[PDB]
Write a protein that binds this ligand. Structure first.
Ligand SMILES: OC[C@H]1O[C@@H](O)[C@H](O)[C@@H](O)[C@@H]1O
Ligand SMILES: [Mg+2]
Length: 244
């Protein structure tokens, strides 16, 4: 029903360069009816909302928050997505395992939710510890996923979650094709978006994990932008000739 499904992360992607953000929102504001907009952020809904007030984020159609662990529709939280993410999820067990790693420190309570267990990796600790955590957690047989971004943030989510799986769920809900979709990201918590078959753009200021990911899995649907922050989205839109 629209020609584009724009999905983007906020911090360091849409947000970061105020001028680029404003001229991106200026362009989009002249063709608002031609696209669905969804923010796929690692922030909680309340936190994303607070960011909107600070930088003046244009009202999106959907909010895919906490790395896609929660989906907000114009009319409210998606309870189907929640129940779907709840099947076979054993938060307490996974948390007990992760809490036992000396190199991991729990992130603040407000960063946690029923489908998201987050920690910070010690800056002095060896990153291979994430690999050990991942192997240990998966051997529990509990459908879990490990997200590592900015060499510091660790997120434990159900396998069914991901900014990418939430995206595919949204595409199906909106009857939008991958070819009509554009995902934008900067870090390891956006890899799930690029695993999707949608067109994607990696901001110039992308984190090391994402750049390394691109080097190995990058395909022709993946565009590595020269512009950083919001500028990369305008650039990608021109590249894939979207909003023709
Ligand atoms: O997803 C990676 C990180 O993104 C941040 O935006 C969230 O506040 C944090 O909880 C998470 O660990
Ligand atoms: Mg990100």
């Amino acid at each position: 029903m629209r020609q584009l499904l724009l999905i983007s992360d906020l911090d360091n992607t849409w947000v970061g360069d105020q001028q680029a953000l404003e001229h991106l929102q200026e362009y989009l504001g002249d063709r608002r009816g031609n696209f669905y907009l969804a923010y796929a952020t690692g922030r909680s809904y309340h936190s994303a909302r607070e960011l909107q007030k600070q930088v003046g984020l244009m009202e999106p159609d959907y909010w895919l928050t906490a790395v896609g662990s929660e989906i907000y529709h114009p009319e409210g939280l998606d309870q189907h997505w929640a129940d779907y993410l709840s099947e076979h999820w054993q938060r307490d067990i996974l948390q007990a395992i992760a809490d036992g790693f000396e190199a991991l420190k729990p992130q603040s309570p407000l960063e946690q939710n029923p489908w998201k267990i987050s920690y910070h990796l010690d800056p002095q600790a060896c990153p291979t510890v994430i690999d050990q955590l991942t192997e240990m957690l998966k051997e529990t047989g509990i459908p879990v996923q490990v997200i590592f971004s900015s060499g510091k943030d660790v997120d434990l989510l159900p396998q069914r979650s991901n900014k990418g799986n939430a995206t595919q769920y949204l595409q199906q809900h909106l009857a939008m094709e991958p070819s009509q979709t554009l995902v934008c990201g900067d870090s390891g918590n956006d890899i799930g978006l690029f695993e999707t078959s949608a067109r994607g753009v990696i901001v110039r200021n992308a984190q090391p994990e994402l750049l390394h990911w691109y080097d190995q899995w990058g395909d022709s649907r993946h565009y590595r932008a020269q512009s950083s922050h919001a500028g990369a989205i305008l650039e990608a839109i021109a590249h894939f000739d979207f909003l023709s």
